[PDB]
Design an enzyme around this catalytic site. Structure first.
Site, PDB file in Angstrom:
ATOM      1  N   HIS A  40      44.763 -33.974 -51.949  1.00 11.75           N
ATOM      2  CA  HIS A  40      44.829 -32.746 -51.173  1.00 11.75           C
ATOM      3  C   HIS A  40      44.811 -33.037 -49.672  1.00 11.75           C
ATOM      4  O   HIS A  40      45.031 -32.144 -48.856  1.00 11.75           O
ATOM      5  CB  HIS A  40      43.680 -31.828 -51.594  1.00 11.75           C
ATOM      6  CG  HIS A  40      42.305 -31.902 -50.941  1.00 11.75           C
ATOM      7  ND1 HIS A  40      41.277 -32.449 -51.568  1.00 11.75           N
ATOM      8  CD2 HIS A  40      41.945 -31.317 -49.765  1.00 11.75           C
ATOM      9  CE1 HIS A  40      40.242 -32.222 -50.791  1.00 11.75           C
ATOM     10  NE2 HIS A  40      40.659 -31.534 -49.735  1.00 11.75           N
ATOM     11  N   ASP A  84      42.754 -35.747 -58.017  1.00 12.57           N
ATOM     12  CA  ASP A  84      42.844 -35.632 -56.573  1.00 12.57           C
ATOM     13  C   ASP A  84      42.574 -36.977 -55.891  1.00 12.57           C
ATOM     14  O   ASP A  84      41.495 -37.335 -55.411  1.00 12.57           O
ATOM     15  CB  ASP A  84      41.849 -34.542 -56.142  1.00 12.57           C
ATOM     16  CG  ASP A  84      41.925 -34.217 -54.677  1.00 12.57           C
ATOM     17  OD1 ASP A  84      42.924 -34.577 -54.037  1.00 12.57           O
ATOM     18  OD2 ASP A  84      41.001 -33.629 -54.152  1.00 12.57           O
ATOM     19  N   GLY A 175      36.209 -31.273 -44.046  1.00 10.64           N
ATOM     20  CA  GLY A 175      36.462 -32.360 -43.144  1.00 10.64           C
ATOM     21  C   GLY A 175      35.954 -33.665 -43.700  1.00 10.64           C
ATOM     22  O   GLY A 175      36.305 -34.726 -43.177  1.00 10.64           O
ATOM     23  N   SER A 177      36.438 -34.316 -46.954  1.00 12.65           N
ATOM     24  CA  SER A 177      37.421 -34.564 -48.006  1.00 12.65           C
ATOM     25  C   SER A 177      38.170 -35.884 -47.875  1.00 12.65           C
ATOM     26  O   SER A 177      38.505 -36.303 -46.768  1.00 12.65           O
ATOM     27  CB  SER A 177      38.442 -33.434 -48.040  1.00 12.65           C
ATOM     28  OG  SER A 177      37.846 -32.260 -48.695  1.00 12.65           O
ATOM     29  N   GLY A 178      38.391 -36.575 -48.991  1.00 12.08           N
ATOM     30  CA  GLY A 178      39.067 -37.877 -49.000  1.00 12.08           C
ATOM     31  C   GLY A 178      38.081 -39.021 -48.798  1.00 12.08           C
ATOM     32  O   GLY A 178      38.406 -40.151 -49.121  1.00 12.08           O
TER      33      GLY A 178
HETATM   34  P1  LIG Z   1      37.678 -30.950 -47.912  1.00 10.35           P
HETATM   35  O1  LIG Z   1      39.064 -30.529 -47.613  1.00 10.35           O
HETATM   36  O2  LIG Z   1      36.956 -31.290 -46.657  1.00 10.35           O
HETATM   37  C1  LIG Z   1      36.924 -29.560 -48.845  1.00 10.35           C
HETATM   38  N1  LIG Z   1      37.803 -29.333 -49.953  1.00 10.35           N
HETATM   39  C2  LIG Z   1      38.866 -28.591 -49.741  1.00 10.35           C
HETATM   40  O3  LIG Z   1      38.741 -27.499 -49.182  1.00 10.35           O
HETATM   41  O4  LIG Z   1      39.776 -28.645 -50.834  1.00 10.35           O
HETATM   42  C3  LIG Z   1      39.398 -28.139 -52.143  1.00 10.35           C
HETATM   43  C4  LIG Z   1      39.076 -26.650 -52.130  1.00 10.35           C
HETATM   44  C5  LIG Z   1      40.075 -25.724 -51.884  1.00 10.35           C
HETATM   45  C6  LIG Z   1      39.769 -24.380 -51.881  1.00 10.35           C
HETATM   46  C7  LIG Z   1      38.482 -23.956 -52.108  1.00 10.35           C
HETATM   47  C8  LIG Z   1      37.490 -24.879 -52.355  1.00 10.35           C
HETATM   48  C9  LIG Z   1      37.779 -26.230 -52.368  1.00 10.35           C
HETATM   49  C10 LIG Z   1      35.503 -29.720 -49.354  1.00 10.35           C
HETATM   50  C11 LIG Z   1      34.992 -30.912 -49.797  1.00 10.35           C
HETATM   51  C12 LIG Z   1      33.709 -30.905 -50.306  1.00 10.35           C
HETATM   52  C13 LIG Z   1      32.954 -29.741 -50.360  1.00 10.35           C
HETATM   53  C14 LIG Z   1      31.648 -29.733 -50.829  1.00 10.35           C
HETATM   54  N2  LIG Z   1      30.935 -28.613 -50.826  1.00 10.35           N
HETATM   55  N3  LIG Z   1      31.078 -30.859 -51.220  1.00 10.35           N
HETATM   56  C15 LIG Z   1      33.509 -28.564 -49.908  1.00 10.35           C
HETATM   57  C16 LIG Z   1      34.777 -28.557 -49.399  1.00 10.35           C
END
Ligand SMILES: *P(=O)(O)[C@@H](NC(=O)OCc1ccccc1)c1ccc(C(=N)N)cc1
Ligand SMILES: [Ca+2]
Length: 223
Positions: A40, A84, A175, A177-178
């Protein structure tokens, strides 16, 4: 990262920032020319920034290398976030040392109860937004398959695990993510998704790297 601590400059030498004019995702260096991240996070025109602590200030240890190729997992589903994971090949090999180093891939899947280190430059608040400039760290346990499935009924596949605290307060966030989840010196997870950040009963969900080791090794062997 919410409820974590400042890692300390270059204490996480495999941590990568993916930059497209600004930081948008983390990653993990797995050898001198390949970075693993979340599918993603795929974007065209990625620059990989290695050796980072403060991402807004040049402090002396960084290496900025453009990506030549990005390979998203053949079965990535953007709706469910199953599989992912993506690989990024660097245009030039990085120079490895104590401060930028690769993390090894796992020979076995980690079990529930194992403590891991999650790191990234993502948001530090569960309400509101405040992005740090320096790398943040969180130690958190892998949770059982059952608590993970009870927190997200009908959404957890075999390629995902939960890690964190069911009482909330500590989690990865937007932020991050990855980025890496390292347990016992091996890359076990990739920060993938969650419902908000650090909420009660909604722990972070992570890509289970041990299911992808054959695909990673085969892909980097011929690309
Ligand atoms: P990442 O992009 O920093 C974030 N996930 C992201 O938004 O993609 C998946 C997603 C899409 C739509 C709704 C929810 C999730 C992310 C990574 C980790 C967490 C966490 N609470 N650990 C949250 C968001
Ligand atoms: Ca820097």
């Amino acid at each position: 990262i919410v409820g974590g601590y400042t890692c300390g400059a270059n204490t996480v030498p495999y941590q990568v920032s993916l930059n497209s004019g600004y930081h948008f995702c983390g990653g993990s260096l797995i050898n001198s020319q390949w970075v693993v991240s979340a599918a993603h996070c795929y974007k065209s025109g990625i620059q990989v920034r290695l050796g980072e602590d403060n991402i807004n200030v040049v402090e002396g240890n960084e290496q900025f290398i453009s990506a030549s190729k990005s390979i998203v997992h053949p079965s990535y589903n953007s709706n469910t976030l199953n599989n992912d994971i993506m690989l990024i090949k660097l245009k030039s090999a990085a120079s490895l040392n104590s401060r930028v180093a690769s993390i090894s891939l796992p020979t076995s899947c980690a079990s529930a109860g194992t403590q891991c280190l999650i790191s990234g430059w993502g948001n530090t608040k569960s309400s509101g937004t405040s992005y740090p400039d320096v790398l943040k760290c969180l130690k958190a346990p892998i949770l059982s398959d059952s608590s993970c499935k009870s927190a997200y009924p009908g959404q957890i596949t075999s390629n995902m695990f939960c890690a964190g605290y069911l009482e909330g307060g500590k989690d990865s966030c937007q932020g991050d993510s990855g980025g890496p989840v390292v347990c016992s010196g091996k890359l076990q997870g990739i920060v993938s998704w969650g419902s908000g950040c650090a909420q009660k009963n909604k722990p972070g969900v992570y890509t289970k790297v041990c299911n992808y080791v054959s695909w990673i090794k085969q892909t980097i062997a011929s690309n």
